[PDB]
Structures are given as structure tokens and as C-alpha cells.
Amino acid sequence: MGPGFDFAQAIMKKNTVIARTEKGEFTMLGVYDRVAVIPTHASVGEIIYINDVETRVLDACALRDLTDTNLEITIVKLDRNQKFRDIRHFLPRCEDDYNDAVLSVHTSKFPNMYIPVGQVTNYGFLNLGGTPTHRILMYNFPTRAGQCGGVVTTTGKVIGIHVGGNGAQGFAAMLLHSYFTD
């Protein structure tokens, strides 16, 4: 409907796949080459389904900060025959607050879904399902089951992936450029 939704749509159309694990269907953001991200609670194994196709996982790393605290981001390298468009230049370099963000989801349950969530706070620490978690972004939207892995964008930046909510607020794990230096 406006330039926020335009950037969000461009990311969804070229840089997302539907990932299925034994824990559910997730929006999965492709970042560059065969490297993607997904919430750690997806419990990625040796094999994953990508757009309903059986795919070997070449590497999977559940990220933690240097205090050994969960970040809720798993970086996955997929044995796929095609590369993602390189979007690393859209990733923020530092932890920050944002205005006017969009959360975008693409699954069998929620196809072509876009939500204007508004202001995004650098929340920091969250007890997420009992797990102490750092680098959490917060937005005041009543997000629901089905939205985990959803992409959070502003115009020109891909800032996080949706990892949970409490019924009134939604929470995303930060994406930082430093995660994807090769």
C-alpha cells in the first residue's frame, strides 16, 4: 500500500522459502548463496523440507552471544541447486530502535501476509518460552502462532525475524551484518 510494503514485498518475493521441520512450517529468510535463517525453536535437523522438497542441511548453527546467551537465530546452509539474491547490504550493523516496520509471513496457513507493526523497540533481554534470550526487538502487535520466522523490515533494512509474542506484544531476534561475514 506504500513504500514500506513495497520493500517488504520485494524481500518476500525473492528471499523467502517455506521451511518445514518436525516442529512446524516456518517463513525462512534466504540471506546469500545457500545460507538462510530460521528461529532456533524450529529444531533444524539433518534434513528439512524447502517448498515441500526434501533438502539436506549442510550446516546449522544456533547462534549465542559471547555471554553464551541464546539469540534464537539458527543459520542454515541448504543443499539447494540455486542461490538466494545477496541481501547482506540490507542488514543493520548495530543494535537499534526503528520506526514504521512491517512483519511479512508466507506459509500454507498465512500466504502473502503483511502486518504494519509500527514502532520497534530495542528490548534486549527476554525470557522467551523459559529461555533467557538477548538482542530482542519488540513491537506492540498481537502476533499469533503461524508468524514465527516472519521477516521484519523497514524501508531499505531487513532488521529481524519474528520468534514469539505474549498476546499483546510481538518479539523478533535481531539480524546483524556480522552474523553473515563469509
Coordinates of N, CA, C and O in Angstrom, one line a residue:
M1 N 0.8 -1.2 0.0 CA 0.0 0.0 0.0 C 0.9 1.3 0.0 O 0.3 2.3 -0.3
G2 N 2.1 1.2 0.3 CA 3.1 2.3 0.4 C 4.6 1.7 0.4 O 4.8 0.5 0.3
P3 N 5.6 2.6 0.5 CA 7.0 2.2 0.3 C 7.6 1.2 1.3 O 8.5 0.4 0.9
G4 N 7.0 1.1 2.5 CA 7.3 0.0 3.5 C 6.9 -1.3 3.0 O 7.7 -2.3 3.0
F5 N 5.6 -1.4 2.5 CA 5.0 -2.6 2.0 C 5.8 -3.0 0.7 O 5.9 -4.2 0.4
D6 N 6.2 -2.0 -0.1 CA 6.9 -2.3 -1.4 C 8.3 -3.0 -1.1 O 8.6 -4.0 -1.7
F7 N 9.1 -2.5 -0.1 CA 10.3 -3.1 0.3 C 10.1 -4.5 0.8 O 10.7 -5.5 0.4
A8 N 9.1 -4.7 1.7 CA 8.7 -5.9 2.3 C 8.4 -7.0 1.2 O 8.9 -8.1 1.3
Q9 N 7.6 -6.6 0.2 CA 7.1 -7.5 -0.8 C 8.3 -7.9 -1.7 O 8.4 -9.1 -2.1
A10 N 9.3 -7.0 -1.9 CA 10.5 -7.3 -2.7 C 11.3 -8.4 -2.0 O 11.8 -9.4 -2.6
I11 N 11.4 -8.3 -0.7 CA 12.2 -9.3 0.1 C 11.4 -10.6 0.1 O 12.0 -11.7 -0.1
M12 N 10.1 -10.6 0.3 CA 9.3 -11.9 0.3 C 9.4 -12.6 -1.0 O 9.5 -13.8 -1.0
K13 N 9.3 -11.9 -2.1 CA 9.1 -12.5 -3.5 C 10.4 -13.2 -3.8 O 10.3 -14.2 -4.6
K14 N 11.6 -12.7 -3.4 CA 12.8 -13.3 -3.9 C 13.6 -14.0 -2.8 O 14.5 -14.8 -3.2
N15 N 13.4 -13.6 -1.5 CA 14.4 -14.0 -0.5 C 13.7 -14.9 0.6 O 14.2 -15.0 1.7
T16 N 12.5 -15.5 0.3 CA 11.9 -16.4 1.3 C 11.5 -17.7 0.7 O 11.3 -17.8 -0.5
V17 N 11.6 -18.7 1.5 CA 11.1 -20.1 1.2 C 10.2 -20.5 2.4 O 10.3 -20.0 3.5
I18 N 9.4 -21.5 2.1 CA 8.6 -22.2 3.2 C 9.5 -23.3 3.7 O 9.7 -24.3 2.9
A19 N 9.9 -23.3 5.0 CA 10.7 -24.4 5.6 C 9.7 -25.2 6.5 O 8.9 -24.7 7.3
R20 N 9.8 -26.5 6.4 CA 9.1 -27.5 7.3 C 10.1 -28.3 8.1 O 10.9 -29.0 7.4
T21 N 10.0 -28.3 9.4 CA 10.7 -29.3 10.3 C 9.6 -30.1 11.0 O 8.5 -29.9 10.7
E22 N 10.0 -31.0 11.9 CA 9.1 -31.8 12.8 C 8.4 -30.9 13.8 O 7.4 -31.3 14.3
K23 N 8.8 -29.6 13.9 CA 8.2 -28.7 14.8 C 7.2 -27.7 14.1 O 6.6 -26.9 14.8
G24 N 7.0 -27.8 12.8 CA 6.1 -26.9 12.1 C 6.6 -26.4 10.7 O 7.7 -26.7 10.3
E25 N 5.7 -25.5 10.1 CA 6.0 -24.8 8.9 C 6.5 -23.3 9.3 O 5.8 -22.8 10.2
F26 N 7.5 -22.8 8.8 CA 8.1 -21.5 9.1 C 8.4 -20.7 7.9 O 8.8 -21.3 6.9
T27 N 8.2 -19.4 7.9 CA 8.8 -18.5 7.0 C 10.3 -18.6 7.2 O 10.8 -18.5 8.3
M28 N 11.1 -18.7 6.1 CA 12.6 -18.8 6.2 C 13.2 -17.8 5.3 O 12.8 -17.8 4.1
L29 N 14.0 -16.9 5.8 CA 14.7 -15.8 5.0 C 16.0 -16.3 4.5 O 16.8 -16.8 5.3
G30 N 16.1 -16.3 3.2 CA 17.4 -16.6 2.5 C 18.3 -15.3 2.5 O 17.7 -14.3 2.1
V31 N 19.6 -15.4 2.8 CA 20.4 -14.1 3.0 C 21.4 -14.0 1.9 O 21.6 -12.9 1.4
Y32 N 22.1 -15.1 1.5 CA 23.0 -15.1 0.4 C 23.4 -16.5 0.1 O 23.3 -17.4 1.0
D33 N 23.8 -16.8 -1.2 CA 24.3 -18.1 -1.6 C 23.2 -19.1 -1.1 O 22.1 -19.0 -1.6
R34 N 23.6 -20.2 -0.3 CA 22.6 -21.2 0.1 C 22.3 -21.0 1.6 O 21.9 -22.0 2.2
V35 N 22.6 -19.9 2.1 CA 22.5 -19.6 3.6 C 21.2 -18.9 3.9 O 20.9 -17.9 3.3
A36 N 20.5 -19.4 4.9 CA 19.2 -18.9 5.3 C 19.2 -18.8 6.8 O 20.1 -19.4 7.5
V37 N 18.1 -18.2 7.4 CA 17.9 -18.2 8.9 C 16.5 -18.7 9.2 O 15.6 -18.6 8.4
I38 N 16.4 -19.1 10.4 CA 15.1 -19.6 10.9 C 15.1 -19.5 12.5 O 16.2 -19.6 13.0
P39 N 14.0 -19.4 13.2 CA 14.1 -19.5 14.6 C 14.7 -20.8 15.1 O 14.4 -21.9 14.6
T40 N 15.5 -20.7 16.2 CA 16.1 -21.9 16.8 C 15.1 -22.9 17.3 O 15.4 -24.1 17.1
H41 N 13.9 -22.5 17.7 CA 12.9 -23.4 18.2 C 12.3 -24.2 17.1 O 11.5 -25.2 17.3
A42 N 12.7 -23.9 15.8 CA 12.3 -24.9 14.7 C 13.0 -26.2 14.8 O 12.6 -27.2 14.1
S43 N 14.1 -26.3 15.6 CA 14.9 -27.6 15.8 C 15.3 -28.2 14.4 O 14.9 -29.4 14.1
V44 N 16.0 -27.4 13.7 CA 16.5 -27.9 12.3 C 17.4 -29.2 12.6 O 18.3 -29.1 13.4
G45 N 17.2 -30.2 11.8 CA 18.0 -31.4 11.8 C 18.9 -31.6 10.6 O 19.3 -30.6 10.0
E46 N 19.1 -32.9 10.2 CA 20.0 -33.2 9.1 C 19.3 -33.0 7.7 O 19.9 -32.9 6.7
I47 N 17.9 -33.1 7.8 CA 17.0 -33.0 6.6 C 15.9 -32.0 7.0 O 15.4 -32.0 8.1
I48 N 15.5 -31.1 6.0 CA 14.5 -30.1 6.1 C 13.7 -30.1 4.8 O 14.2 -30.5 3.8
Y49 N 12.4 -29.7 4.9 CA 11.6 -29.5 3.6 C 11.6 -28.0 3.3 O 11.4 -27.2 4.1
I50 N 12.0 -27.7 2.0 CA 12.1 -26.3 1.5 C 11.0 -26.3 0.3 O 11.2 -27.0 -0.7
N51 N 9.9 -25.6 0.5 CA 8.9 -25.5 -0.5 C 8.4 -27.0 -0.9 O 8.3 -27.3 -2.1
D52 N 8.3 -27.8 0.1 CA 7.8 -29.2 0.1 C 8.8 -30.2 -0.6 O 8.4 -31.2 -1.1
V53 N 10.1 -29.8 -0.7 CA 11.1 -30.6 -1.3 C 12.1 -31.0 -0.2 O 12.7 -30.1 0.5
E54 N 12.4 -32.3 -0.1 CA 13.4 -32.9 0.8 C 14.8 -32.3 0.5 O 15.2 -32.4 -0.7
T55 N 15.4 -31.7 1.5 CA 16.7 -30.9 1.3 C 17.7 -31.3 2.4 O 17.3 -31.2 3.6
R56 N 18.9 -31.7 2.1 CA 19.9 -32.0 3.1 C 20.4 -30.7 3.7 O 20.5 -29.7 2.9
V57 N 20.6 -30.7 5.0 CA 21.2 -29.5 5.7 C 22.7 -29.7 5.7 O 23.1 -30.7 6.3
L58 N 23.4 -28.8 5.1 CA 24.9 -28.9 5.0 C 25.5 -28.5 6.3 O 26.6 -29.0 6.7
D59 N 24.9 -27.5 7.0 CA 25.4 -26.9 8.3 C 24.2 -26.2 8.9 O 23.4 -25.6 8.2
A60 N 24.2 -26.2 10.2 CA 23.2 -25.5 11.0 C 23.9 -25.0 12.3 O 24.6 -25.8 13.0
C61 N 23.8 -23.7 12.6 CA 24.4 -23.2 13.8 C 23.5 -22.3 14.6 O 23.0 -21.3 14.0
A62 N 23.1 -22.8 15.8 CA 22.2 -22.0 16.7 C 23.1 -20.9 17.4 O 24.0 -21.3 18.2
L63 N 22.9 -19.7 17.0 CA 23.7 -18.6 17.5 C 23.5 -18.2 19.0 O 22.4 -18.3 19.4
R64 N 24.6 -17.9 19.7 CA 24.6 -17.4 21.1 C 25.5 -16.2 21.2 O 26.4 -16.2 20.3
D65 N 25.2 -15.3 22.0 CA 26.2 -14.1 22.2 C 27.4 -14.6 23.0 O 27.5 -15.8 23.4
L66 N 28.3 -13.7 23.2 CA 29.6 -14.0 23.8 C 29.4 -14.2 25.3 O 30.4 -14.8 25.9
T67 N 28.3 -13.8 25.9 CA 27.9 -14.3 27.3 C 27.3 -15.7 27.3 O 27.0 -16.2 28.4
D68 N 27.2 -16.4 26.1 CA 26.7 -17.8 26.0 C 25.2 -17.7 26.3 O 24.7 -18.6 27.0
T69 N 24.5 -16.6 25.9 CA 23.1 -16.5 25.9 C 22.4 -16.7 24.6 O 22.9 -16.2 23.5
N70 N 21.3 -17.5 24.5 CA 20.5 -17.7 23.3 C 20.3 -16.4 22.5 O 19.8 -15.4 23.1
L71 N 20.4 -16.5 21.2 CA 19.9 -15.4 20.3 C 18.7 -15.8 19.5 O 18.1 -14.9 18.9
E72 N 18.3 -17.1 19.5 CA 17.1 -17.6 18.9 C 17.2 -17.6 17.4 O 16.2 -17.9 16.7
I73 N 18.4 -17.4 16.8 CA 18.7 -17.4 15.3 C 19.5 -18.7 15.1 O 20.6 -18.9 15.7
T74 N 19.0 -19.5 14.2 CA 19.8 -20.6 13.6 C 20.1 -20.3 12.1 O 19.2 -19.9 11.3
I75 N 21.4 -20.3 11.8 CA 21.9 -20.1 10.4 C 22.0 -21.5 9.8 O 22.7 -22.4 10.3
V76 N 21.4 -21.7 8.6 CA 21.3 -23.0 7.9 C 21.9 -22.8 6.6 O 21.5 -21.9 5.8
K77 N 22.8 -23.7 6.2 CA 23.2 -23.8 4.8 C 22.6 -25.0 4.2 O 22.7 -26.2 4.7
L78 N 21.9 -24.8 3.1 CA 20.9 -25.8 2.4 C 21.6 -26.4 1.2 O 22.3 -25.7 0.4
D79 N 21.5 -27.7 1.0 CA 22.0 -28.4 -0.2 C 20.9 -28.2 -1.3 O 20.3 -29.1 -1.7
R80 N 20.8 -26.9 -1.8 CA 19.9 -26.4 -2.8 C 20.7 -26.2 -4.1 O 21.8 -25.7 -4.0
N81 N 20.0 -26.3 -5.2 CA 20.7 -26.1 -6.5 C 20.6 -24.7 -7.0 O 21.0 -24.4 -8.2
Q82 N 20.2 -23.7 -6.2 CA 20.1 -22.3 -6.6 C 20.5 -21.4 -5.4 O 20.3 -21.8 -4.3
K83 N 21.1 -20.3 -5.7 CA 21.5 -19.3 -4.7 C 20.3 -18.3 -4.5 O 19.5 -18.0 -5.4
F84 N 20.3 -17.7 -3.3 CA 19.5 -16.5 -3.0 C 20.2 -15.3 -3.5 O 21.4 -15.2 -3.5
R85 N 19.4 -14.3 -3.9 CA 19.9 -12.9 -4.1 C 20.6 -12.5 -2.8 O 20.0 -12.7 -1.7
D86 N 21.7 -11.9 -2.9 CA 22.5 -11.5 -1.8 C 21.9 -10.2 -1.2 O 21.9 -9.1 -1.9
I87 N 21.3 -10.3 0.0 CA 20.7 -9.1 0.7 C 21.5 -8.7 1.9 O 20.9 -7.9 2.7
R88 N 22.8 -9.1 2.0 CA 23.5 -8.7 3.2 C 23.7 -7.2 3.4 O 23.8 -6.7 4.5
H89 N 23.6 -6.4 2.3 CA 23.8 -4.9 2.3 C 22.5 -4.3 2.9 O 22.6 -3.1 3.2
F90 N 21.4 -5.0 3.1 CA 20.2 -4.5 3.8 C 20.2 -4.8 5.3 O 19.2 -4.4 6.0
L91 N 21.3 -5.5 5.8 CA 21.3 -5.8 7.3 C 21.9 -4.7 8.0 O 23.0 -4.2 7.7
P92 N 21.4 -4.3 9.2 CA 22.0 -3.4 10.1 C 23.3 -3.8 10.7 O 23.5 -5.1 10.8
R93 N 24.2 -2.9 10.9 CA 25.5 -3.2 11.5 C 25.4 -3.3 13.0 O 26.2 -4.0 13.7
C94 N 24.5 -2.5 13.7 CA 24.4 -2.4 15.1 C 23.0 -2.6 15.6 O 22.0 -2.4 14.8
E95 N 22.9 -2.8 16.9 CA 21.6 -2.9 17.7 C 20.9 -1.5 17.6 O 21.7 -0.5 17.8
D96 N 19.7 -1.4 17.4 CA 19.0 -0.2 17.2 C 17.5 -0.3 17.4 O 17.0 -1.5 17.5
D97 N 16.8 0.8 17.6 CA 15.3 1.0 17.5 C 15.0 1.5 16.1 O 15.8 2.1 15.4
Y98 N 13.7 1.3 15.7 CA 13.2 1.6 14.4 C 11.8 2.2 14.4 O 11.0 1.8 15.3
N99 N 11.5 3.0 13.4 CA 10.1 3.4 13.1 C 9.5 2.6 11.9 O 10.3 2.3 11.0
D100 N 8.2 2.4 12.0 CA 7.3 2.1 10.9 C 7.8 0.8 10.2 O 8.3 0.8 9.1
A101 N 7.8 -0.3 11.0 CA 8.3 -1.6 10.5 C 7.1 -2.4 10.0 O 5.9 -2.2 10.4
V102 N 7.3 -3.4 9.1 CA 6.4 -4.4 8.6 C 6.9 -5.8 8.9 O 8.1 -6.0 8.8
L103 N 5.9 -6.6 9.4 CA 6.2 -8.0 9.6 C 5.5 -8.8 8.4 O 4.3 -8.6 8.3
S104 N 6.3 -9.6 7.7 CA 5.7 -10.3 6.5 C 5.9 -11.8 6.7 O 7.1 -12.3 7.0
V105 N 4.9 -12.6 6.4 CA 4.8 -14.0 6.6 C 4.4 -14.7 5.3 O 3.5 -14.2 4.6
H106 N 4.9 -15.8 5.0 CA 4.5 -16.6 3.8 C 4.5 -18.1 4.2 O 5.6 -18.7 4.2
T107 N 3.4 -18.7 4.5 CA 3.3 -20.1 4.8 C 2.0 -20.7 4.1 O 1.2 -19.8 3.6
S108 N 1.8 -22.0 4.1 CA 0.4 -22.6 3.7 C -0.7 -22.0 4.5 O -1.8 -21.7 4.0
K109 N -0.5 -21.7 5.8 CA -1.6 -21.1 6.7 C -1.8 -19.6 6.4 O -3.0 -19.2 6.3
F110 N -0.7 -18.9 6.2 CA -0.8 -17.4 6.0 C 0.0 -17.0 4.8 O 1.1 -16.5 4.9
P111 N -0.5 -17.2 3.6 CA 0.2 -16.7 2.3 C 0.0 -15.2 2.1 O -1.0 -14.6 2.4
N112 N 1.2 -14.6 1.7 CA 1.1 -13.2 1.2 C 0.6 -12.3 2.4 O -0.1 -11.3 2.0
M113 N 1.0 -12.5 3.6 CA 0.5 -11.8 4.8 C 1.5 -10.7 5.1 O 2.8 -10.9 5.2
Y114 N 1.1 -9.4 5.3 CA 1.9 -8.3 5.6 C 1.2 -7.5 6.8 O 0.1 -7.2 6.6
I115 N 1.9 -7.2 7.8 CA 1.4 -6.5 9.0 C 2.2 -5.2 9.3 O 3.4 -5.3 9.6
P116 N 1.6 -4.0 9.3 CA 2.3 -2.8 9.7 C 2.3 -2.8 11.3 O 1.3 -2.7 11.9
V117 N 3.5 -3.0 11.9 CA 3.6 -3.2 13.3 C 4.0 -1.9 14.0 O 3.9 -1.8 15.2
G118 N 4.4 -0.9 13.2 CA 4.8 0.4 13.7 C 6.1 0.4 14.4 O 7.1 -0.1 13.8
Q119 N 6.2 1.1 15.6 CA 7.5 1.4 16.3 C 8.1 0.1 16.8 O 7.4 -0.7 17.4
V120 N 9.4 -0.1 16.6 CA 10.1 -1.3 17.1 C 11.2 -0.8 18.1 O 12.1 0.0 17.8
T121 N 11.1 -1.4 19.4 CA 12.0 -1.1 20.5 C 13.1 -2.1 20.5 O 12.9 -3.3 20.4
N122 N 14.3 -1.6 20.8 CA 15.5 -2.5 21.2 C 15.2 -2.9 22.7 O 15.5 -2.1 23.6
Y123 N 14.5 -4.0 22.8 CA 14.0 -4.5 24.1 C 15.2 -5.2 24.9 O 15.2 -5.0 26.2
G124 N 16.0 -5.9 24.2 CA 17.2 -6.6 24.8 C 16.9 -7.9 25.4 O 16.7 -8.9 24.6
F125 N 16.8 -8.1 26.7 CA 16.6 -9.4 27.4 C 15.1 -9.7 27.4 O 14.3 -8.9 27.6
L126 N 14.9 -11.0 27.0 CA 13.5 -11.6 27.1 C 13.7 -13.0 27.6 O 14.5 -13.8 27.1
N127 N 12.8 -13.4 28.6 CA 12.6 -14.9 28.9 C 11.6 -15.4 27.9 O 10.4 -15.2 28.1
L128 N 12.1 -16.1 26.9 CA 11.3 -16.5 25.7 C 11.0 -18.0 25.9 O 11.9 -18.8 25.7
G129 N 9.8 -18.3 26.3 CA 9.4 -19.7 26.5 C 10.3 -20.4 27.6 O 10.7 -21.5 27.4
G130 N 10.7 -19.6 28.6 CA 11.6 -20.1 29.7 C 13.1 -20.0 29.4 O 13.9 -20.3 30.2
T131 N 13.5 -19.5 28.1 CA 14.9 -19.5 27.7 C 15.4 -18.0 27.7 O 14.9 -17.2 27.0
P132 N 16.4 -17.7 28.6 CA 16.9 -16.3 28.6 C 17.5 -16.0 27.2 O 18.2 -16.8 26.6
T133 N 17.0 -14.9 26.6 CA 17.3 -14.6 25.2 C 17.8 -13.1 25.1 O 17.2 -12.3 25.8
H134 N 18.8 -12.8 24.3 CA 19.3 -11.4 24.1 C 18.9 -10.9 22.7 O 18.5 -11.6 21.8
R135 N 19.2 -9.6 22.5 CA 19.0 -8.9 21.2 C 17.6 -9.0 20.7 O 17.4 -9.2 19.4
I136 N 16.6 -8.9 21.5 CA 15.2 -8.9 21.2 C 14.7 -7.5 20.8 O 15.0 -6.6 21.5
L137 N 14.0 -7.5 19.7 CA 13.2 -6.3 19.2 C 11.7 -6.5 19.6 O 11.2 -7.7 19.5
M138 N 11.0 -5.5 20.0 CA 9.6 -5.6 20.4 C 8.7 -4.6 19.6 O 9.2 -3.5 19.4
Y139 N 7.5 -5.1 19.3 CA 6.5 -4.3 18.6 C 5.2 -4.6 19.2 O 4.9 -5.7 19.7
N140 N 4.3 -3.6 19.3 CA 3.0 -3.7 20.0 C 2.0 -4.2 19.0 O 1.1 -3.3 18.7
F141 N 2.1 -5.4 18.6 CA 1.0 -6.1 17.8 C 0.8 -7.5 18.3 O 1.8 -8.2 18.5
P142 N -0.5 -7.9 18.4 CA -0.9 -9.2 19.0 C -0.7 -10.3 17.9 O -1.6 -10.9 17.4
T143 N 0.6 -10.6 17.7 CA 1.1 -11.7 16.8 C 0.6 -13.1 17.3 O 0.5 -13.2 18.6
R144 N 0.5 -14.1 16.4 CA -0.1 -15.4 16.8 C 0.8 -16.5 16.2 O 1.7 -16.2 15.4
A145 N 0.5 -17.7 16.7 CA 1.0 -18.9 16.1 C 0.9 -18.8 14.6 O -0.1 -18.2 14.1
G146 N 1.9 -19.3 13.9 CA 2.0 -19.2 12.4 C 2.9 -18.1 11.9 O 3.2 -18.2 10.7
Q147 N 3.3 -17.2 12.8 CA 4.1 -16.0 12.3 C 5.6 -16.2 12.6 O 6.4 -15.3 12.1
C148 N 6.0 -17.2 13.3 CA 7.4 -17.4 13.6 C 8.2 -17.6 12.3 O 7.8 -18.3 11.4
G149 N 9.3 -16.8 12.2 CA 10.2 -16.8 11.1 C 9.8 -15.6 10.2 O 10.6 -15.3 9.2
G150 N 8.7 -15.0 10.5 CA 8.3 -13.8 9.7 C 9.3 -12.8 9.6 O 10.1 -12.6 10.6
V151 N 9.5 -12.1 8.5 CA 10.6 -11.1 8.3 C 10.1 -9.7 8.8 O 9.0 -9.3 8.3
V152 N 10.9 -9.1 9.6 CA 10.7 -7.7 10.0 C 11.6 -6.7 9.2 O 12.8 -6.9 9.2
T153 N 11.0 -5.8 8.5 CA 11.7 -4.8 7.6 C 11.3 -3.4 7.9 O 10.2 -3.2 8.4
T154 N 12.1 -2.5 7.6 CA 11.8 -1.1 7.4 C 12.1 -0.8 5.9 O 12.8 -1.6 5.3
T155 N 11.8 0.4 5.4 CA 12.3 0.8 4.1 C 13.8 0.7 4.1 O 14.5 1.4 4.8
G156 N 14.3 -0.2 3.2 CA 15.8 -0.3 3.0 C 16.5 -1.2 4.0 O 17.6 -1.4 3.8
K157 N 15.8 -1.7 5.1 CA 16.5 -2.6 6.0 C 15.7 -3.8 6.4 O 14.5 -3.8 6.6
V158 N 16.4 -4.9 6.5 CA 15.9 -6.2 7.0 C 16.5 -6.4 8.4 O 17.7 -6.6 8.6
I159 N 15.6 -6.2 9.5 CA 16.1 -6.0 10.8 C 16.0 -7.2 11.7 O 16.6 -7.2 12.8
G160 N 15.2 -8.2 11.4 CA 14.9 -9.3 12.4 C 14.0 -10.3 11.8 O 13.4 -10.2 10.7
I161 N 13.8 -11.4 12.6 CA 12.9 -12.5 12.3 C 12.0 -12.7 13.6 O 12.6 -12.8 14.7
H162 N 10.7 -12.8 13.4 CA 9.7 -13.0 14.5 C 10.0 -14.3 15.2 O 10.1 -15.3 14.5
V163 N 10.0 -14.3 16.5 CA 10.3 -15.5 17.3 C 9.3 -15.8 18.4 O 9.4 -16.8 19.0
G164 N 8.4 -14.8 18.7 CA 7.4 -15.1 19.7 C 6.5 -13.9 20.0 O 6.6 -12.8 19.4
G165 N 5.6 -14.1 21.0 CA 4.7 -13.0 21.5 C 4.1 -13.3 22.8 O 4.2 -14.5 23.2
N166 N 3.4 -12.4 23.4 CA 2.7 -12.6 24.7 C 1.2 -12.3 24.6 O 0.6 -12.2 25.7
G167 N 0.7 -12.2 23.4 CA -0.7 -11.9 23.2 C -1.0 -10.4 22.9 O -1.9 -10.1 22.1
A168 N -0.2 -9.5 23.4 CA -0.3 -8.0 23.2 C 1.0 -7.5 22.4 O 0.8 -6.6 21.6
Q169 N 2.1 -8.0 22.7 CA 3.4 -7.7 22.1 C 4.0 -8.8 21.2 O 3.6 -10.0 21.5
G170 N 4.7 -8.5 20.2 CA 5.4 -9.5 19.3 C 6.9 -9.2 19.5 O 7.3 -8.1 19.8
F171 N 7.7 -10.2 19.3 CA 9.2 -10.2 19.6 C 9.9 -10.8 18.4 O 9.6 -11.9 17.9
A172 N 11.0 -10.1 18.0 CA 11.9 -10.6 16.9 C 13.3 -10.7 17.4 O 13.7 -9.8 18.1
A173 N 14.1 -11.6 16.8 CA 15.5 -11.7 17.0 C 16.2 -10.8 16.0 O 15.8 -10.9 14.8
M174 N 17.1 -10.0 16.5 CA 17.9 -9.1 15.6 C 18.6 -9.9 14.5 O 19.2 -10.9 14.8
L175 N 18.6 -9.3 13.3 CA 19.7 -9.8 12.3 C 20.7 -8.6 12.2 O 20.4 -7.5 12.1
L176 N 22.0 -9.0 12.3 CA 23.1 -8.1 12.2 C 24.1 -8.6 11.1 O 24.2 -9.8 10.8
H177 N 24.6 -7.6 10.4 CA 25.6 -7.9 9.2 C 26.7 -8.9 9.6 O 27.1 -9.8 8.9
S178 N 27.2 -8.7 10.8 CA 28.3 -9.5 11.4 C 28.0 -11.0 11.5 O 28.9 -11.8 11.6
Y179 N 26.7 -11.4 11.5 CA 26.4 -12.8 11.5 C 26.8 -13.5 10.2 O 26.8 -14.7 10.2
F180 N 26.9 -12.8 9.1 CA 26.9 -13.3 7.7 C 28.2 -12.9 6.9 O 28.2 -12.9 5.6
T181 N 29.2 -12.6 7.6 CA 30.6 -12.4 7.1 C 31.1 -13.9 6.7 O 30.9 -14.8 7.7
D182 N 31.5 -14.1 5.5 CA 31.8 -15.5 5.0 C 33.4 -15.7 5.0 O 34.0 -16.1 4.1

